[PDB]
């Protein structure tokens, strides 16, 4: 039986978004690539290199025209005509625009591709921008986080395959099942917030009783995500706040990588 094709392109990526797939359990990366999809191009895992892997991409773009899911991780650098990310001697923005032409669905995985992320922070030395900015005519599905829980991506792909369409998206084109609510509007430390029970420093008495991390700079009040409910790694009870560290807002433009760890969030 034929599996739906996927083309995965890395731009200004740290490779964390690919590495997240190695933590996934439903599907596991081995079930993903053998049973769920045909991963037709992915530079991190391909047996083929060089001219052979570029052959594989061209064959796949033609053979599966109008049928493949395009996935991009990393921001796309526009400064100085795209020279800050060059693959096979051509700017990555050109590879991405070409692959976008025949895509059935386009997914920006991670905060970098979704809104510029860490690569576009501060002075933005390379003119890094989001996938949606380089593809203004297309609907890009954004799966933010640095990196997101891999199932935020895999359940989005599964929806496309199983039901023939994208999941419901909010007005930033993020899937509502994973990004439809503020972390602070579904955080198990909310009772402590409400009671004025706050950790003031790591290692203090309140911190060691699992109190609210607002005063350590928790950005849950201005960050959309499923980090408090879905959490990470499928072991139970693992997300940053549960471990004792405030949310940094890595999902959310203007929060993660812009505000200091210990800078307070605005509360609605």
């Amino acid at each position: 039986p034929q599996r739906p094709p996927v083309i995965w392109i890395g731009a200004q990526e740290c490779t964390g978004c690919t590495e997240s797939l190695l933590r996934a359990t439903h599907p596991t990366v081995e079930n993903l690539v053998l049973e769920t999809i045909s991963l037709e191009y992915h530079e991190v895992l391909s047996a083929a290199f060089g001219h052979q892997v570029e052959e594989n991409k061209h064959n796949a773009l033609e053979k599966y025209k109008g049928q493949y899911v395009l996935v991009v991780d990393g921001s796309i650098p526009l400064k100085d005509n795209g020279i800050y990310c060059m693959v096979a001697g051509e700017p990555i923005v050109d590879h991405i625009r070409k692959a976008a032409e025949g895509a059935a669905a386009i997914i920006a995985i991670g905060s970098c591709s979704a809104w510029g992320g860490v690569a576009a922070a501060g002075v933005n030395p390379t003119g890094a921008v989001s996938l949606q900015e380089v593809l203004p005519g297309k609907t890009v599905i954004n799966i933010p986080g640095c990196p997101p829980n891999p199932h935020n991506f895999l359940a989005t792909v599964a929806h496309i395959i199983t039901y023939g369409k994208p999941p419901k998206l909010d007005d930033k084109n993020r899937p509502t099942f994973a990004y439809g609510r503020l972390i602070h509007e579904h955080c198990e430390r909310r009772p402590h917030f409400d009671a004025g029970r706050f950790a003031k420093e790591f290692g203090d008495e309140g911190h060691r009783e699992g109190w609210c991390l607002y005063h350590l700079g928790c950005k849950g009040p201005e960050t959309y995500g499923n980090c408090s409910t879905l959490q990470f790694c499928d072991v139970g009870g693992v997300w940053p706040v549960a471990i004792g560290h405030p949310c940094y807002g890595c999902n959310e433009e203007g929060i993660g990588f812009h505000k200091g760890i210990h800078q307070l969030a605005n509360v609605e």
Binding site: L22, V33, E43, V53, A121, F202, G203, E209, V235
Partner: protein
């Protein structure tokens, strides 16, 4: 005579181009080029020192944890903070578990397909394949029935006509030497590796809050609240959970990964005589266990001109000899300032002008140690451990050698470790030794908490005037990592990362001397210049990470 380009190099992290001149079927000269830059050093400038780690962790997601730990160590070095010993044990567990994940993924998912022919696996007899491993491994999942099931997955994939990531590989290439049976074994182990690496990352996650990109560090210690009697914090139940995953790693590492390393050496013995990258080697000590950022479980040092007997030990992360030696040059890199710079005075000013064989051809800087090129990473690390007379490392090497001898009737000598296969062997040894680091540090944590010590964090103060410099060293999976922070008027006035793949992948230096990747390729036979498999074999042995190299 002939010029080739390998672009992209796959099964690495990030964006790499390798060019080679080939003369009489042998690589005569090579160029390594990092083709992507983000400017992470510039992005983290002018921020509070405490904020850096969360930003610079994003240099790389493959070697996640490493930049985070090196950054807080750098801030702690500038500020003169002694990290509480429970924070060290937690940091050590994370690094050790992470590195276990990383090395396994490297051997199997990144490297194996250079040496292993999946189409040849289809011809294998599963029973013979199983029979081949009797008295070589005690691994419980080497049965004919396991191999038959893996063989049938390959068979179904091939019949589907959608090979995906296995499409257009180097099946039938003359440099592929494994019998069908051994190819089938390797693929089974490739799939089994994915379960072990997941268990390693569960350890990381339970202390880090997630992975990739841990979120439990702080300048001053860790954010894990230790309280055996606390709800919602790091209590005895959570510690027991962590331990359950630590205990699942050892068998695969010892009975599969270690054994496969010896087996690949046995079938490719010529790869013990090529791929030498340098004559100087550097590693730092790792896994501090005292309350003053020292008493390292793994030693470090500097080896000059392959002389183990006269190596210089490094036992401290504030070693002024180590600190003063390190510089980087951009003569053949796309940056403006070309003279060798000490990283506290470093600049990263982009100056792309296109590719030139004799000018600038990479976003990777060229690091030197007292003016010399140096190899870093698991080979450096192993040789340094052998130089120091570390019995654990000699014994683990000997176990691999014994398996190799059983298969070939030959031995391995230290001279043969300065090679592509020697590099891979060092990595495997490193992974095996890390399993005892995990056991030791978990036990130290449990014992220390039981003595009544629940401290995890010293709150830093940062003076609002004055200029202070700090450096954070760490022995990462790919080698010696250093972050260099200058604080001025309370904020980061300079930030430089010198990353292990920078050392190895860096282009020709200020004196035009050749770095490890480029040197290792000279003399590589290339059977088919359209399909230069032999070149990526050598490059992959270094475990390249270009996001790391360039940042």
């Amino acid at each position: 005579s002939q010029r080739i380009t390998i672009d992209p190099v796959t099964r690495i992290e990030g964006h790499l181009r390798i060019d080679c001149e080939i003369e009489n079927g042998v690589v005569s000269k090579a160029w390594a080029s990092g083709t992507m830059w983000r400017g992470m050093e510039e992005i983290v400038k002018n921020r509070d020192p405490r904020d850096a780690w969360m930003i610079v962790q994003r240099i790389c997601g493959v070697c996640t944890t490493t930049h985070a730990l090196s950054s807080v160590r750098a801030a702690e070095s500038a500020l003169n903070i002694d990290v509480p010993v429970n924070a060290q044990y937690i940091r050590n567990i994370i690094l050790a578990a992470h590195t276990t994940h990383d090395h396994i993924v490297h051997f199997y998912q990144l490297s194996a397909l250079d040496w292993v022919d999946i189409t040849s696996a289809l011809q294998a007899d599963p029973t013979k394949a199983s029979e081949m491993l009797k008295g070589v491994s005690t691994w419980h999942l080497n049965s004919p029935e396991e191999f038959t099931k893996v063989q049938n997955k390959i068979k179904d994939l091939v019949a589907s006509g959608q090979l995906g990531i296995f499409a257009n590989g180097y099946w039938g290439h003359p440099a592929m030497k494994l019998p069908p049976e051994v190819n089938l074994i390797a693929v089974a182990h490739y799939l089994q590796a994915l379960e072990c690496q997941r268990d390693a990352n569960r350890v990381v996650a339970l202390l880090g809050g997630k992975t990739p990109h841990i979120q439990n560090l702080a300048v001053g210690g860790v954010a894990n609240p230790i309280n055996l009697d606390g709800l919602g914090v790091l209590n005895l139940e959570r510690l027991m959970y962590i331990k359950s995953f630590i205990d699942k790693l050892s068998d695969f590492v010892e009975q599969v990964y270690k054994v496969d390393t010896a087996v690949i050496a046995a079938f490719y013995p010529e790869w013990l005589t090529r791929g030498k990258g340098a004559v100087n080697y550097l590693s730092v000590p790792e896994f501090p266990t005292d309350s003053k950022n020292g008493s390292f479980l793994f030693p470090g040092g500097y080896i000059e001109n392959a002389d183990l007997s006269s190596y210089r030990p490094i036992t401290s992360h504030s070693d002024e000899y180590l600190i003063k030696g390190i510089q980087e040059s951009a003569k053949h890199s796309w940056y403006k300032d070309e003279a060798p710079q000490a990283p506290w005075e470093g600049t990263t000013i982009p100056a792309y002008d296109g590719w030139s064989d004799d000018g600038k051809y990479s976003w990777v800087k060229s690091p030197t140690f007292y003016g010399k090129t140096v190899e870093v990473g698991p080979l450096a690390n192993m040789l340094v451990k052998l130089a120091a007379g570390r019995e654990s490392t000699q014994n683990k090497l000997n176990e691999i050698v014994a398996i190799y001898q059983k298969l070939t009737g030959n031995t391995l000598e230290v001279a043969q470790l300065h090679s592509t296969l020697g590099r891979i062997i060092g990595r495997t040894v490193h992974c095996c030794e890390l399993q005892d680091i995990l056991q030791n540090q978990y036990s130290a944590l449990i014992t220390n908490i039981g003595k009544g010590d629940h401290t995890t964090f010293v709150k830093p103060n940062i003076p609002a005037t004055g200029e202070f410099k700090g450096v954070g060293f760490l022995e990462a999976p790919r080698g010696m990592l250093s972050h260099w922070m200058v604080i001025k008027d309370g904020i980061i006035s300079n930030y430089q990362a010198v990353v292990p793949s920078t050392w190895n992948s860096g282009p020709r230096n200020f004196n035009d001397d050749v770095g490890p990747y480029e040197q290792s390729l000279v003399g590589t036979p290339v059977a088919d210049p359209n399909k230069p498999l032999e070149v990526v074999r050598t490059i992959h042995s270094f475990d390249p990470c270009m996001a790391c190299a360039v940042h």
